[PDB]
Amino acid sequence: SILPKRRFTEEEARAPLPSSFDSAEAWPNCPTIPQIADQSACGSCWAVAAASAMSDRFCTMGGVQDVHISAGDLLACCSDCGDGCNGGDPDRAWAYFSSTGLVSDYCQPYPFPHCSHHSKSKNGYPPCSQFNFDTPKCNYTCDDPTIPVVNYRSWTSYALQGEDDYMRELFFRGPFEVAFDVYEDFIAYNSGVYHHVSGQYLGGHAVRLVGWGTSNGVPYWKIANSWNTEWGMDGYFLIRRGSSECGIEDGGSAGIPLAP
Ligand SMILES: *[C@@H]1O[C@H](CO)[C@@H](O[C@@H]2O[C@H](CO)[C@@H](O)[C@H](O)[C@H]2NC(C)=O)[C@H](O)[C@H]1NC(C)=O
Numbered sequence: 001s002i003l004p005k006r007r008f009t010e011e012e013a014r015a016p017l018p019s020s021f022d023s024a025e026a027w028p029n030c031p032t033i034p035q036i037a038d039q040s041a042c043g044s045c046w047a048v049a050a051a052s053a054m055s056d057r058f059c060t061m062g063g064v065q066d067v068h069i070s071a072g073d074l075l076a077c078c079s080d081c082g083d084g085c086n087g088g089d090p091d092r093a094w095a096y097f098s099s100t101g102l103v104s105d106y107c108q109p110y111p112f113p114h115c116s117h118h119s120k121s122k123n124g125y126p127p128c129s130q131f132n133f134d135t136p137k138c139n140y141t142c143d144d145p146t147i148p149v150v151n152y153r154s155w156t157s158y159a160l161q162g163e164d165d166y167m168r169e170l171f172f173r174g175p176f177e178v179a180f181d182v183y184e185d186f187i188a189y190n191s192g193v194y195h196h197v198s199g200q201y202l203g204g205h206a207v208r209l210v211g212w213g214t215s216n217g218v219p220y221w222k223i224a225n226s227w228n229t230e231w232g233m234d235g236y237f238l239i240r241r242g243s244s245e246c247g248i249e250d251g252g253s254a255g256i257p258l259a260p
């Protein structure tokens with residue numbers, strides 16, 4: 001990891017964490033948390049999950065109730081992060097949030113429309129396979145140039161590893177970015193607690209971690225996916241917690257938004 005490891009204070013460390021936890025119920029006055037993103041026909045999961053968590057953390061920590069951080073800005077302008085719509089690194093996305101900063105969804109709206117990721121779309125989105133999107137151009141003015149550019153920054157970035165870090169960080173500071181390996185059997189998930197049993201490896205996938213809990217003696221993470229609200233359980237999925245399922249507990253990325 002390029003980011004420094006998160007160290008917990010003596011007070012944070014000794015906190016008795018609850019058997020279940022939900023970020024939306026923990027910060028009920030933060031409207032960005034329960035919102036689900038759509039990355040569209042682009043490999044921008046690394047950027048979209050980051051911008052979602054940064055938006056959440058401006059409410060949990062930054063003192064701003066409802067600001068949406070522009071995934072598009074991060075996607076296009078962080079060339080050191082990866083190759084835009086062809087994949088990137090969550091760690092470097094958070095490093096960019098502090099060293100340079102990001103505009104809001106209002107300044108630079110996400111350039112790609114809704115599309116269907118699994119199969120059938122009840123709202124009538126075209127298939128995402130129908131679209132082939134290149135990495136958008138990095139812009140330095142708001143799409144509507146008459147809207148002033150407001151730049152949003154964090155003041156620190158750190159990495160996280162393992163069940164306890166994830167839980168402890170989530171509890172104190174809210175949603176952050178994690179990553180895991182996708183297999184064929186994940187694509188059609190719609191219920192239950194996910195566990196890889198069959199299917200070919202497809203690729204890495206960055207996502208936003210919002211909660212934990214236990215269902216019928218099976219501990220799990222509650223995760224916000226970025227395949228719009230029609231995928232999984234209303235945009236979310238549950239995954240096995242405790243034994244790094246698909247490497248979900250191998251690396252997490254987070255930081256603290258600065259009050260502007
Ligand atoms: C930066 O602005 C440019 C130009 O306004 C955007 O590029 C256009 O994006 C639309 C919607 O995806 C496409 O239909 C056009 O073909 C693009 N035009 C050109 C000239 O590139 C771009 O999406 C913006 N970038 C971001 C990150 O918002």
Ligand code: NA
Nearest residue numbers: 161162164165
């Ligand atoms: Na840990």
